[PDB]
Each structure stands twice: as C-alpha cells, then as structure tokens.
C-alpha cells in the first residue's frame, strides 16, 4: 500500500478515467498531486463491474482519452463497441504508460472531508486512519459508483448465491445447471442476462417497468479504416467535442411531427438495422415534444412486438408509460431473441410485484420461484451517492449532505457556494451522463486543473462559487430541463430509484458543446461566478 502524503496541492478521489487524468494533468502542470482509491486498481466502473456481457454502448473510437497523441496512434481498438476486459486493458495501459500508479493509494476509502477556513485548506481522512492536508479537493469519485438494492426484505434469508452487477466477483462465476433469477432489466440486466442464459438450467428474469432497447449491432473494426482515422485522429475528437452528445451522432434536422408515416418508417428503419444509440437524434423534437417522441416510441415497440415470437411475452416487453429516450437508451445484443428460448422466463412484477425475498426465491403476489442464484442488476445510487458516503464539511461546518438534501446544488456542476477549493468531476448540474463521457470527463479535468494553475500562478489560495449564481445555475438547470420531456419519468437521472431521494432532474441538457462554451467564457473573464482570494 502506497503510504500517502501528509501534505498535497491537490488530492484527488477515485481512479477511473477522470481521477488518472486529473493526477496526469497536474502532475505536468507542476503540481503535488495524490489519488486516494478504494479498489486495488485503477479502472472504476470497468474495474467494478466485470458481470459478463459487459460492454460500453458509445463506439470504441469515440470512447477513449484524446489528451495523448502517442495513446492515439499505438492503441488499437477491435471491435464497434469495447468489452469491459478491453476497456480496463485500455486503461491498464494508460496508467502504465504515464506511470500513474505512483500517485495512487489503493484499498483506501476516504470517509470525511472537512474545509479550513483559518488555513484555506481542506483535511481529508481515510478508513486506515490516514490525514491529508490539501489545499484543492477533487472529487472523481464517479457518477454510477455506489450499488443500489431493491427495496424489498428478505435478502439476507435468501439460502443460494446473491451478486450485485456493480460488485462483481474478480473470478468468473459458474451458473452451470442453476435456476437463476436476475432482477432488474436496465442497461446491466440486458447485457448480463443473456450470458446467464447460456449456462443456467432455467433463467427468471424480472422485469418492473420495461427500458427501450434497440440493436447494437456489434461488428469487427475494420483495421483499414483504424489506420486511416489514426490519420485525423486529433481533428475528429474535435468534431466530437463540438456537439451536442459528444460523439459523431447525426443531427437529425427535421420534426418527427413534419413528416409522413411513410418517411419516419422508412428514416427510423435505416436507423435500427444500422444499430447504436443514433436514433436519438433521429429527428430534432424527439426529447421536446410528447406527440412526436410518441411516434418514434411507437416505430420501437412495433419492432419489438416482432422479436419475440409469443405474442403475450412480447407485449409483457413493451415499454409503457414514459417517453421515449427518458430514461436511458440501451443498446442490446441477443436480448429479446432470449425470450425464444425453452428456458428463459419474463416475470412480470409490474401485474405481480415483488413482496420479499425467500430462502428459497422470490415471492410475487401471484407465485414463489425457487431459485440456486440471484443476480441484482438494481442500479446505483446516482450522482450524489458516492459524495454523501463521505462526512464532507464546508464553511460553519455545513454538511455536503443537508445542503444538497433537497437536491444538488452547483454552479455550472464544478462547484457549490459554502464549499471553498472543492471540484466535481462529471456529476450533477452538468452534461455528464447525457453525453459520451470521456468527453464531459476531460472537459472538466482540464478547466479544474486549469483553474487550479490559475490560482498558484496569481498566488490566491481560496476560489469559492458566489451564492446567488449558484442559484441562478440551479433554476437555470431546471428551467431547461423542464422544456425537455426529461423531468417527466421516474429515473436514476430524477433519483427515483433511491428510496426518499429528493425527485428532481440532476443534469445540465443544453448539450455538451453549449456548456463547454460556458465554461471557457467563465475562464475568461477570470472566472466570473467564483470569488478569489
Ligand atoms: C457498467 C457501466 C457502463 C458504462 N458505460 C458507459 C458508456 O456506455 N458510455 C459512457 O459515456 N459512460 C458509461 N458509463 C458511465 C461511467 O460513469 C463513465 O463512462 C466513466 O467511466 C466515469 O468515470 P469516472 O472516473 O468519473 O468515475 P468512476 O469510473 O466511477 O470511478 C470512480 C472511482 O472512485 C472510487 N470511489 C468512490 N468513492 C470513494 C471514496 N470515498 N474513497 C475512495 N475511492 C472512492 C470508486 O471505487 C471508483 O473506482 C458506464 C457506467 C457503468 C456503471
Ligand atoms: N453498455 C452500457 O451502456 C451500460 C451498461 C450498464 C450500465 N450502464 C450505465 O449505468 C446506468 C444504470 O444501469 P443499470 O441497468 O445498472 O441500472 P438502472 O438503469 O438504474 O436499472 C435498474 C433496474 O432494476 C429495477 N429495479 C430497481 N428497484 C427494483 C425493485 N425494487 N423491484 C423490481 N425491480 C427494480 C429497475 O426497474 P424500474 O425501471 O421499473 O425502476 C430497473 O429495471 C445505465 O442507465 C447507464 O448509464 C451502461
């Protein structure tokens, strides 16, 4: 274990992407720079979560760090979209190359964080009994990084094997003859699901409310093709940078509404052989306007209506209720073709909810399933979770935790009133998860690392977001939202799978490269919005 300094410039939580950048970037910028990391390596979700199947939904080309031109040129990506083995090789190298696990103190949790005022410093304490005094605290402590579980009793009676997707065992798990029951049929339930299939004797799936899924069409990459866009590497992320979804997504420029049946089968059709994500932006309104994202939901529920060859279990798959795109689209690969086969099972517990967990299964309110494995792929508790696990204590020792109870207040995301010299990466009141993230993740590392040179180049030592625009930020962000259909469905974006969780839409939807032009506007000026001293 890498004993960490008693004293830092900056000290950064988490190692995934955005915790390596930031130690990267800092290090160069001349800084005394630390990572603290609970897991023994570096990865964070590609290190946590190695249920089988997994897999990134945003193409191999578009998902991996542009800061290096050399990491550019020599990697080399196989496939459309990157397995989680791959992924974590992918950032196995990086840390290699860089030599960053130098910096880092792994099977390390920080517990409490506390702000200075005398000192303009914050003093940082772990579960080994560790203290760091840092002067700016980073929080990259991730945005699906905490394991939610469903809200049922009974799951430590449960006789048989329990697993979380998110805390996978390192060594893979053997399913071989079990009745296995996965509950949860987002992204993690429709990629792990039909890996299960294939060893277990008999698979329940339970399914709530069922989540669009379309094609992902996964495919060999094309090695020619590599080679050639290794030759405009840096110009194409640049076109990626300036979009609204950070990736080469078409900007469809039409109305779902303007255009005849005819035409939106015919576009949507080209879309869904095609496969990806890249129907969200079929048509400009799709995420706007309730009548139009209503006819593209139909196209996808006529589609998957058509995959499932019994018609009452292919009904029991149709997404209802909620709008199209709201909550997150899933990209599948042999989900609903599962459902064909002799020993795969949709439970529905939206007609029969779950009442409690067994020793022996599940019970609904209509019949006990005796299971030998349960598989929990319930989600995480978003965006804020990570950060409340940790006693955070701004100015008049207020808790990160009560002044955001009613949900998270920022400005522009980077920072919040109260809370002097502390930095989130990627989290609430910006694009984060609503767009590629690798992309939302060096934009941050680089205007926080940036700013933080800023201040040690003028000799300031406290940067502090001013109240009222904080505020401004926070109904500017609703505001927005609320011109979106976002706002309208219960999600982990809303907090809605958390029990008690405040319901209010935690992210920045003007798109990443209107935010990005915010930013720089912000660092212009000086950093209008913080006050500096
Ligand atoms: C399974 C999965 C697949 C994903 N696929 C996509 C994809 O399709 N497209 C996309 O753009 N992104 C996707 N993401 C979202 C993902 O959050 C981002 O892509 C990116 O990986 C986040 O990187 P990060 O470093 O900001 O956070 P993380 O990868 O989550 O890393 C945070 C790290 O900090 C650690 N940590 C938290 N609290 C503490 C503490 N108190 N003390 C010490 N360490 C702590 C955690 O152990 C973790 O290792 C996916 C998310 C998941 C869960
Ligand atoms: N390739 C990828 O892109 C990929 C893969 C995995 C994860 N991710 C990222 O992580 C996010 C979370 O993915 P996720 O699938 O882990 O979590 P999720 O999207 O939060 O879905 C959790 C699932 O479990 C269900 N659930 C929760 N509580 C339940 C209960 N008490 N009873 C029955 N069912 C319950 C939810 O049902 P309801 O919807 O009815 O609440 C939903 O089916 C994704 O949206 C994406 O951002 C990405």
Redo the contacts with the bound molecule.
Sequence with gaps: RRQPPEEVDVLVVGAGFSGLYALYRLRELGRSVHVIETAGDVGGVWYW?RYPG?????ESIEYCYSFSEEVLQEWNWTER?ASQPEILRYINFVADKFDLRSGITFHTTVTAAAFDEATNTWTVDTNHGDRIRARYLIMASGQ?SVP?L???PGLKDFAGNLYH??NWPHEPVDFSGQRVGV?????????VSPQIAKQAAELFV????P?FAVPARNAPLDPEFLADLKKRYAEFREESRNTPGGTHRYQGPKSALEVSDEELVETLERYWQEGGPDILAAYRDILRDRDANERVAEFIRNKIRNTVRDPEVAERLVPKGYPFGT??L??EIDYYEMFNRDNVHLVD??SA??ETITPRGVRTSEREYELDSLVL????D?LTGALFKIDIRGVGNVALKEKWAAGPRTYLGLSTAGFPNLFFIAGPGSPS?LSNMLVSIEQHVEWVTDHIAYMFKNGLTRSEAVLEKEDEWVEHVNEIADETLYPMT???YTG??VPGKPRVFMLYVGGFHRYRQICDEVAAKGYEGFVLT
């Design positions: 979560n997994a897999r990134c939904d945003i979209y699906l939610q469903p809200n049922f997707t998110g509950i949860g049929t987002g992204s993690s339930g429709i990629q339970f399914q709530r409310t989540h909550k997150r899933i990209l517990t939206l909810p779950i792929a319930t989600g995480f978003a998860a219960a999600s982990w809605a799978n």
